[PDB]
């Protein structure tokens, strides 16, 4: 048991994956083994909502999370977020599930039965954590994996079969998309935009040639960005202000990847790009949108003149105007004028809402689109209760968009927790005093008196 | 030799849990107020003093089971078993809220008996009795809440019931109808048990992240022995690093530990004060130089009046089902209501 | 104008302007001491401790 | 005598293989019988409303609390 | 306490009356909260809250739809309030079960029960159903 | 010997009265900026349109406030999400009206308090410590993140965060249970077992520490001179303490580790109060606490409350008055 109790490693057993931190075969079976769970669970909760779906429903009424991913894919999609299939999500989690028994042997293979170190029989796979040319290299190779991987959905939505676009026009559909915008002051253009309202930093993409576009050139990067990390070795900046330790490896990942939870909580809060609404349901601002424009479209029938209604307090009741200008709705969703959904777009002008778009032509889906999406609003409890925190125990519906964001709000921050623990651990370890104080030479005795 | 000294050697010899003098107290009255309160919350209803479900025959949960507080019909009866309402009908006796009172009132006693064991258990040690000082908190809490607030109302109708939920209740019926936020006894009561967990945290992650290396392993725990006479961590550095950082450290672990000693016992003794004075209703309600202005001035708005209209939803919308006794009708046209809400 | 998608907050090219020459204010600080470093100079650590 | 050796003494388990699970099903004849209903006063959920009494009940009287509960639970 | 006696309900125009069996109660409760519940929770309409569900909302509809006939009719044929012009194209119905999905798999024994489910409803909560949130 | 090299020095140097550091670069211009622009807002501002509705809210001293009602009121429900600093507002006075001062404090405030945390790294860095304590100083960060910025970003509008002032965080609170039920949310029941049990182990470690003092000190002299700041020794007797509390409890339920206990210390209130930040940051995006409401039925199918019914009446009380002039439709979806 050399290396595997506390006295050998210094570790106890609660922090018992910290003993591989300097054994790269056993770190290696650590790491391809937890890739068997997650291409595990891929297959079985895509399998379960395969199992569990209904077609009277709408995906977003059965709390579904990954088929609504496969439908964005554009597998078994109709128009208007029609489910047609579902036998291409049943094929996509049987491939995910026996997958993950190649990976699960393989990770028991490299962590029971395998080399503890690669260094000494394998010099292409062997590494010292300090050897910052080595580093660099299996940085570069899966940085471009993962550019080949951004490739993949740009070919799935240029060639194979194409993407669901719900700005599609003849109604949301799969669509291919043939002219990606390949513009980098747009495509960049989301990515040093202000995260505020009305910018919505890299969430407010709209439209499918945008999305396809930046994958493109996160495609290339990728690529360039790998094979330069490949060639090169870190410069002088680079090694004066990093810690080159494993610990400190992964609290730069763990920092990368917390920013990216929080990004993708609020790409399933606020974007109905990709994020479509016939799949997730509304979104937060989509929902109250709905009941203002429901409200509006059932008061213009006993014939109120809806521009010149006067709220209690004497703004809009349904139609007012935004603080730069805009024709939006009234009322407390105000603040959610800068909403862009698909079935409110076809009454915008350049002025915001028109008013004889509204006066005249409202069509009869657009009034059952916003009937639903007034009824699904992303408010809901704990045990799936629908409605706010005063409704009673008959609806069972919990958005995914709520599932989606609070869930990795959650883990996001915790990853955050993650890069201060292991950040501040691997500087300590560094500099050799993350077991306590020397009491031979503590350093503030041999300071100035501080006053 | 004596009687009294066989017994008093048999109390308090030393065996796997201490009895002492004091446990003849404590755990007779503890066991049948922690007993009581599994009883009541696994089968006892509520139906006939609140009319709600309040036990697991029912259908509630943990957080929904409660044992409910007496009718308020009885008043401020002590509601024994053979007293003039039960009777000596164990029955009757559960269904008009008698298990309340005997949880409330043999919690009590256990309570003191709990803090004589811990003057009693420090006598022997031959310590300070501090322990029992700071223990003063919580039965200042029990006293003011669950014996003398309902003792100055109607009845013990308006206790807080020994639930999760019953309990939930009791914070937001001391908001609509007594302010309580707004009083400053519980300001300085949520300071001093926010400022406790406070100290807790900094206390508990200053001494973990100051300690001296006395082992090899990275695993610090090890390297502490229960009889070393050194210092497990560094109070030079410890006191550099908050002085640096805040601008005041402490000085003194003798005045550090006195001070997480007083911060949350001084929280539980001034918030008992501010809910003594609600037992009366002395609450601290209105500022009225905001109040007369608001009368007179139809746009002044502060957060303050802002927080009356949320009181006056409070009182209206939940009084006829919280005080059904009273049998508060209310029509659907003086309820107040904001507009489209 | 908020709610327009500009880089950085940049409407006027004053702003870019005092975005460069502060930021390249503080770089010739620090290339007053990292300047004249020596590119081929490594170390096998986790940390170095090279030069002032 | 020590706490985890008791546990793990097959002695132990012996005694408590034949106690607790008697002690496990006289709680649940407890329920299924239907006597901890009449021994707390508890409403099975026939008998919340009654055909005469729609109403919720309530005691309203101190002295004569056990008098109108008994007319309350007479259906 | 489910008796025949409250299980008993007006199934027709003329007033002849039906009692439901305890599969109609307990599946009719099911199909209307899937189907119907989202907008018609408690017997309110969220989407218009000036029709509601409560059985005097009922007797003044102009097709008097305090019926289990009446509002299995609505359900395959739904109108405006004073009946004049159909809302099928806004309202789930089978006319128009091409639009909505969620009527497609019915049967008239499915329309049975959710219409059961509101005949039976206003009978054990009186003024709960339809009544908004004042009686939550 | 450089001009940079001789500024790091002093930037990074422990001799300096409150050390500065490269977060301190971050921290003190962050924290001075919304300090300055607090105290002037809170002792002078005029009302703010909160709702959007233009009902302007005052929040001021010199607008007819006191110290509990006293705030600075959250920006206009108007501006939304939207970012408002004072070039975007074509004057002071627009600015002033439409909350433009919560959200340049609550921005500085979130940059610099987080610039704290870093700076509690850096420190104990620099003076060869255990980097750990800023790790115990994210909960509290957590949970000023939470009621200022991502509750807003969830709701849509920095009109729904906390108010700085005391009595509006009542509203805060209050608005808060009344459209997410927060005490039936166990992540606020995991942060108030964070809280009470925080200061039940602060007052029972604090107790039985100075229950089990050495006699060093005279009747007539304080105890706490019986410590010598600097001393090697230990001040109190702990295995008196774990003696005393062995017999307390009983013998198997005591820390005899020193190190394990202020441990424990460290871990309850801070993971408490992480997991009820995670609850407002979950409740942002309306993932509400238990719903029970009607769920205890007889058998003739009529609704016997509960105590979360009764709970539920008094959740309706609150938002069937909460903003009442801005709501239009009959569902409050923000
Ligand atoms: C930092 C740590 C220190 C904290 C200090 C904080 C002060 C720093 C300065 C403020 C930074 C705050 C970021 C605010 C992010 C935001 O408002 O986030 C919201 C935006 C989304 O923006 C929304 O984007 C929307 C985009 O949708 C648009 O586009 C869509 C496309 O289909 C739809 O069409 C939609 O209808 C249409 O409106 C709209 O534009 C909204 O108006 C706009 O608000 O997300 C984003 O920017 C993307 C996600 C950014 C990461 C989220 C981080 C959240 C912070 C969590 C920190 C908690 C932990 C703290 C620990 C310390
Ligand atoms: C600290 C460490 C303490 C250690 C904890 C020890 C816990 C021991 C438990 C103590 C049990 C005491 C509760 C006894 C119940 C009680 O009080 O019961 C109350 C009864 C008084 O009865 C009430 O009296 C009221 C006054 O009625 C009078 O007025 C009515 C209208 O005028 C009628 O005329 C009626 O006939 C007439 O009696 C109403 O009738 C109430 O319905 C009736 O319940 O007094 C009596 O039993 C005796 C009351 C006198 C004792 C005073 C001390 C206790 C009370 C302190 C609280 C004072 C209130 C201040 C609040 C702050
Ligand atoms: C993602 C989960 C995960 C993974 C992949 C690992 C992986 C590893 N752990 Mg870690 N560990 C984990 C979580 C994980 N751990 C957790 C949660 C804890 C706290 C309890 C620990 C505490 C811990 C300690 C204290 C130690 C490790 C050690 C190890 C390493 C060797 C294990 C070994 O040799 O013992 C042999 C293990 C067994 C004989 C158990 C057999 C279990 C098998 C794998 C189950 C397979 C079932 C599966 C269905 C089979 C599918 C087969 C099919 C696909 C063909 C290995 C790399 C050791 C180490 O670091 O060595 C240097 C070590 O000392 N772990
Ligand atoms: C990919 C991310 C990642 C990786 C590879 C590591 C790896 C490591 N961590 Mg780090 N850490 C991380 C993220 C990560 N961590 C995060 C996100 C946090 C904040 C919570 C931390 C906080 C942390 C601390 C405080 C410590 C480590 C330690 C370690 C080392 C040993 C871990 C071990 O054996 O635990 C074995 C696993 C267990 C004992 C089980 C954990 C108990 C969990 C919480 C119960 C599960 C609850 C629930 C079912 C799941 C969570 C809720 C769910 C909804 C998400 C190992 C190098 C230890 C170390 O520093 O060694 C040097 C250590 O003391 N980590
Ligand atoms: C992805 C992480 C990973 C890495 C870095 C390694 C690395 C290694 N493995 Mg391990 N292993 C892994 C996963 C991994 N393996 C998996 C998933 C399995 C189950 C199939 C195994 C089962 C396994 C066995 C049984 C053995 C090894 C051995 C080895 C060592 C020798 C390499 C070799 O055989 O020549 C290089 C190999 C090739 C050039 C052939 C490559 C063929 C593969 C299938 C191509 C993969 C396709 C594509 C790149 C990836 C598609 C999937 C992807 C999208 C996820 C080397 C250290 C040997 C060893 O440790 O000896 C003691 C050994 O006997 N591995
Ligand atoms: C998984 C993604 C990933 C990760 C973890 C890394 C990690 C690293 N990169 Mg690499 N890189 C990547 C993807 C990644 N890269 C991609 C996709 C590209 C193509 C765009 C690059 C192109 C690249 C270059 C050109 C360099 C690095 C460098 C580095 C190393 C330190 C710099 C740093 O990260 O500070 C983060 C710092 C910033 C985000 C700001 C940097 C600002 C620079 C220094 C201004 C200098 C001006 C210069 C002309 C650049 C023009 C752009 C400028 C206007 C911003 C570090 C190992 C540095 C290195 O040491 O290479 C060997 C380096 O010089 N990377
Ligand atoms: C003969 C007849 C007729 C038969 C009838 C049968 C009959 C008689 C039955 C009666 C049986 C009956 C009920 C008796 C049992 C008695 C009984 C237990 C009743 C009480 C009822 C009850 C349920 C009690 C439970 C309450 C309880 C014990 C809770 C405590 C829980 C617990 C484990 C707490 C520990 C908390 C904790 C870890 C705190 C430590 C943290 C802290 C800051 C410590 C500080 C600290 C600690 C140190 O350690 C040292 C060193 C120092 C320095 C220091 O700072
Ligand atoms: C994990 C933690 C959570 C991570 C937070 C995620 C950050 C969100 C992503 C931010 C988007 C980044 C795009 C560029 C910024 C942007 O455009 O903002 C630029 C925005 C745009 O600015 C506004 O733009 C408007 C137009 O829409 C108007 O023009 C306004 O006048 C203009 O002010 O302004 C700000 O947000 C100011 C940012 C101030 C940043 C200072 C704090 C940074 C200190 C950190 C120390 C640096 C170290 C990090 C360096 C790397
Ligand atoms: C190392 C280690 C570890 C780990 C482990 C792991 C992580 C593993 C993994 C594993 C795995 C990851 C596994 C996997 C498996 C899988 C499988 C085995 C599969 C199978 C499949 C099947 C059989 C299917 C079938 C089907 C079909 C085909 C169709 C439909 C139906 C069904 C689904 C039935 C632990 C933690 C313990 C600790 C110690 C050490
Ligand atoms: C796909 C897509 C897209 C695209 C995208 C992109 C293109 C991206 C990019 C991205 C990017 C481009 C990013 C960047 C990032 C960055 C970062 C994140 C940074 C960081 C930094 C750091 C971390 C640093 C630090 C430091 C300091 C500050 C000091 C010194 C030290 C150190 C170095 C540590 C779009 C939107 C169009 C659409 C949709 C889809
Ligand atoms: C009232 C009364 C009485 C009675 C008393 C007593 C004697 C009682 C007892 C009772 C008891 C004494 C009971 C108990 C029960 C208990 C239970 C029922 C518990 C449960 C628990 C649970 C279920 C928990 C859970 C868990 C676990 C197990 C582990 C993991 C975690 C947790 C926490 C989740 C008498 C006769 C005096 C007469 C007068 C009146
Ligand atoms: O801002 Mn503050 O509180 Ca949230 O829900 Mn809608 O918006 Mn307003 O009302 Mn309710
Ligand atoms: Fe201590």
């Known amino acids: 048991i050399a290396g595997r109790d506390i006295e050998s490693t210094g570790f106890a057993w609660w922090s018992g994956n910290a003993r591989?931190?300097?054994?790269?075969?056993?770190?290696?079976?650590?790491?391809?083994?937890?890739?068997?769970?997650?291409?595990?669970w891929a297959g079985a909760m895509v399998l379960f909502e395969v199992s569990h779906f209904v077609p009277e429903k709408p995906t977003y009424e059965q709390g579904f999370i990954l088929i609504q991913h496969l439908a964005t894919l554009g597998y078994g999609i109709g128009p208007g977020g029609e489910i047609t299939s579902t036998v291409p999500y049943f094929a996509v989690g049987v491939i995910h599930l026996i997958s993950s028994a190649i990976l699960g042997f393989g990770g028991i293979y490299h962590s029971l039965l395998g080399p503890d170190t690669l260094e000494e029989s394998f010099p292409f796979f062997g590494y010292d954590w300090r050897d910052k040319n080595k580093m660099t290299t299996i940085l570069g190779i899966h940085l471009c994996l993962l550019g080949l991987g951004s490739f993949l959905l740009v070919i799935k939505a240029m060639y194979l079969g194409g993407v669901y676009d719900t700005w599609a026009p003849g109604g949301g559909d799969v669509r291919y998309i043939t002219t990606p915008t390949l513009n980098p002051i747009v495509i960049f253009g989301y990515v040093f935009r202000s995260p505020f309202g009305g910018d919505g930093w890299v969430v407010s993409v709209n439209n499918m040639e945008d999305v396809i576009g930046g994958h493109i050139w996160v495609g290339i990067l990728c690529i360039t960005g790998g094979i330069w990390h490949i060639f090169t070795k870190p410069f002088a900046w680079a090694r004066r202000a990093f810690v080159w330790s494993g610990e400190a490896y992964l609290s730069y990942s763990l920092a990368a990847i917390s920013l990216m939870g929080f990004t993708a909580a609020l790409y399933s809060w606020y974007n109905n790009t990709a994020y479509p609404s016939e799949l997730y349901g509304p979104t937060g601002p989509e929902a109250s949108q709905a009941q203002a424009f429901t409200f509006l479209v059932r008061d213009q029938r006993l014939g109120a003149n809806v521009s010149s209604a006067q709220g209690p307090t004497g703004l809009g009741k349904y139609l007012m105007r935004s603080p730069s200008g805009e024709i939006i709705f009234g009322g407390?969703?105000?603040?959610?004028?800068?909403?862009?959904?698909?079935?409110?777009?076809?009454?915008?002008?350049?002025?915001?809402?028109?008013?004889?778009?509204?006066?005249?032509?409202?069509?009869?889906?657009?009034?059952?689109?916003?009937?639903?999406?007034?009824?699904?609003?992303?408010?809901?409890?704990?045990?799936?209760?629908?409605?706010?925190?005063?409704?009673?125990?008959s609806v069972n519906y919990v958005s995914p968009r709520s599932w989606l964001c609070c869930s990795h709000f959650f883990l996001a921050f915790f990853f955050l927790v993650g890069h201060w623990w292991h950040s501040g651990r691997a500087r300590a370890a560094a500099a050799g005093f993350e077991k306590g104080i020397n009491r031979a030479n503590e350093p503030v005795l041999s300071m100035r008196p501080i006053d | 030799r004596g009687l009294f000294d066989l017994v008093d050697d048999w109390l308090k010899k030393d065996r796997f849990v201490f009895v002492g003098w004091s446990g003849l107290l404590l755990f007779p009255t503890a066991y049948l107020a922690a007993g009581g309160w599994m009883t009541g919350t696994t089968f006892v209803t509520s139906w006939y003093t609140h009319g709600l479900a309040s036990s697991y025959l029912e259908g509630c949960n943990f957080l929904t089971a409660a044992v409910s507080t007496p009718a308020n019909s009885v008043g401020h009866s002590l509601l024994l078993l053979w007293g003039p309402e039960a009777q000596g009908d164990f029955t009757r006796w559960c269904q008009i809220g008698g298990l309340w009172t005997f949880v409330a009132l043999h919690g009590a006693f256990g309570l003191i008996g709990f803090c004589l064991r811990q003057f009693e258990i420090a006598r022997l040690v031959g310590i300070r009795p501090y322990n029992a000082i700071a223990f003063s908190g919580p039965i200042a809490v029990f006293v003011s809440v669950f014996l003398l607030y309902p003792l100055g109302q109607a009845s013990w109708f308006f206790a807080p019931s020994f639930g999760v939920a019953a309990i939930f209740r009791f914070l937001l019926f001391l908001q609509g109808f007594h302010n309580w936020t707004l009083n400053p006894f519980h300001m300085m009561g949520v300071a001093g048990i926010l400022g406790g967990a406070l100290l807790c945290a900094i206390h508990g992650a200053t001494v973990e992240n100051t300690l001296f290396e006395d082992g090899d392993a990275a695993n610090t725990f090890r390297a502490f022995t229960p009889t070393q006479s050194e210092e497990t961590y560094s109070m030079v550095t410890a006191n550099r690093f908050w002085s640096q950082i805040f601008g005041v450290a402490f000085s003194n672990k003798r005045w550090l530990h006195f001070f997480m000693l007083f911060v949350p016992v001084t929280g539980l003794w001034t918030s008992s004060i501010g809910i003594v004075g609600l037992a009366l209703n002395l609450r601290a309600y209105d500022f009225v130089s905001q109040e007369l202005r608001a009368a007179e001035d139809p746009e002044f708005e502060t957060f303050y009046t802002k927080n009356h209209l949320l009181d006056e939803g409070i009182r209206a919308w939940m009084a006829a089902q919280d005080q059904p006794h009273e049998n508060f009708v209310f029509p659907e046209e003086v309820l107040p209501r904001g507009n489209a809400l | 104008t908020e709610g327009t998608n500009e880089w950085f907050g940049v409407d006027?090219?004053?702003?870019?302007?005092?975005?460069?020459?502060?930021?390249?204010?503080?770089?010739?600080?620090?290339?007053?001491?990292?300047?004249?470093?020596?590119?081929?100079?490594?170390?096998?650590?986790?940390?170095?401790?090279?030069?002032? | 005598r020590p706490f985890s050796d008791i546990?793990?003494?097959?002695?132990?388990?012996?005694?408590?293989?034949?106690?607790?699970?008697?002690?496990?099903?006289?709680?649940?004849?407890?329920?299924?019988?239907?006597?901890?209903?009449?021994?707390?006063?508890?409403?099975?959920?026939?008998?919340?409303?009654?055909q005469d009494r729609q109403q919720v009940p309530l005691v309203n009287d101190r002295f004569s609390a056990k008098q109108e509960l008994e007319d309350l639970t007479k259906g | 306490d489910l008796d025949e006696a409250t299980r008993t309900v007006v199934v027709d125009n003329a007033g002849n009356t039906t009692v439901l069996t305890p599969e109609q109660v307990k599946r009719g409760k099911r199909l209307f909260n899937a189907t119907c519940g989202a907008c018609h929770v408690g017997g309110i309409t969220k989407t218009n809250p000036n029709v509601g569900l409560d059985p005097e909302a009922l007797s003044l509809a102009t097709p008097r739809r305090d019926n289990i006939s009446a509002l299995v009719d609505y359900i395959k044929n739904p109108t405006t309030y004073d009946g004049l012009e159909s809302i099928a194209e806004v309202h789930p119905s089978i006319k128009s079960a091409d639009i909505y999905p969620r009527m497609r798999s019915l049967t008239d024994e499915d329309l049975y029960s959710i219409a059961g489910h509101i005949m039976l409803s206003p009978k054990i909560a009186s003024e709960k159903w339809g009544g908004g949130k004042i009686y939550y | 010997v450089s001009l940079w090299e001789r500024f790091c020095a002093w930037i990074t140097s422990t001799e300096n009265r409150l050390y500065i550091g490269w977060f301190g670069c971050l921290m003190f211009p962050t924290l001075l900026t919304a300090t300055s622009c607090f105290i002037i807002a809170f002792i002078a501002a005029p009302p703010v349109d909160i709702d959007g509705i233009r009902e302007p809210v005052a929040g001021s001293l010199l607008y007819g406030n006191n110290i509990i009602s006293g705030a600075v009121v959250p920006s206009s429900n108007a501006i939304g999400m939207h970012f408002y600093p004072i070039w975007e507002a074509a004057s002071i006075d627009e600015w002033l009206y439409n909350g433009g001062p919560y959200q340049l404090i609550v921005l500085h405030f979130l940059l610099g308090v987080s610039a704290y945390m870093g700076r509690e790294w850096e420190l104990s860095y620099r003076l060869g410590m255990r980097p750990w304590i800023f790790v115990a100083f994210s909960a509290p960060v957590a949970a000023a993140s939470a009621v200022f910025l991502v509750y807003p970003i969830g709701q849509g509008s920095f009109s729904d965060g906390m108010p700085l002032g005391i009595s509006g965080t009542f509203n805060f609170m209050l608005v808060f249970q009344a459209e997410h039920n927060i005490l039936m949310h166990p992540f606020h029941m995991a942060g108030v077992a964070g809280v009470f049990g925080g200061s039940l182990f602060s007052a029972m470690h604090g107790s039985?520490?100075?229950?089990?003092?050495?006699?060093?000190?005279?009747?007539?002299?304080?105890?706490?001179?019986?410590?010598?700041?600097?001393?090697?020794e230990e001040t109190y007797n702990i295995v008196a303490a774990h003696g005393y509390f062995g017999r307390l409890i009983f013998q198997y339920a005591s820390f005899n580790n020193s190190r394990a206990l202020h441990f424990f210390l460290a871990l309850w209130p801070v993971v408490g109060i992480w997991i009820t930040s995670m609850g407002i940051s979950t409740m942002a995006f309306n993932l509400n606490g238990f719903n029970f409401n009607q769920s205890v039925v007889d058998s003739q199918g009529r609704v016997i409350n509960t105590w979360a019914d009764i709970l539920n009446r008094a959740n309706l009380g609150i938002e069937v008055m909460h903003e009442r002039n801005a709501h239009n439709f009959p569902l409050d979806l923000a």
């Open chain 1, 20 to 40: 591989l931190i300097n054994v790269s075969g056993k770190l290696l079976g650590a790491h391809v083994a937890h890739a068997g769970l997650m291409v595990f």
């Open chain 3, 12 to 52: 006027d090219l004053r702003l870019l302007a005092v975005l460069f020459l502060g930021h390249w204010a503080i770089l010739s600080l620090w290339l007053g001491s990292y300047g004249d470093s020596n590119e081929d100079e490594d170390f096998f650590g986790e940390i170095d401790y090279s030069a002032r």
């Open chain 4, 7 to 50: 546990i793990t003494s097959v002695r132990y388990w012996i005694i408590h293989s034949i106690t607790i699970p008697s002690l496990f099903v006289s709680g649940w004849l407890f329920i299924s019988t239907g006597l901890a209903y009449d021994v707390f006063g508890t409403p099975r959920p026939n008998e919340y409303f009654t």
């Open chain 6, 208 to 232: 039985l520490v100075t229950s089990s003092l050495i006699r060093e000190t005279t009747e007539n002299e304080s105890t706490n001179y019986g410590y010598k700041f600097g001393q090697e």
């Open chain 1, 332 to 393: 407390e969703t105000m603040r959610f004028w800068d909403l862009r959904a698909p079935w409110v777009e076809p009454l915008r002008g350049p002025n915001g809402l028109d008013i004889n778009k509204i006066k005249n032509d409202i069509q009869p889906w657009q009034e059952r689109r916003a009937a639903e999406y007034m009824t699904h609003a992303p408010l809901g409890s704990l045990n799936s209760v629908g409605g706010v925190a005063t409704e009673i125990n």
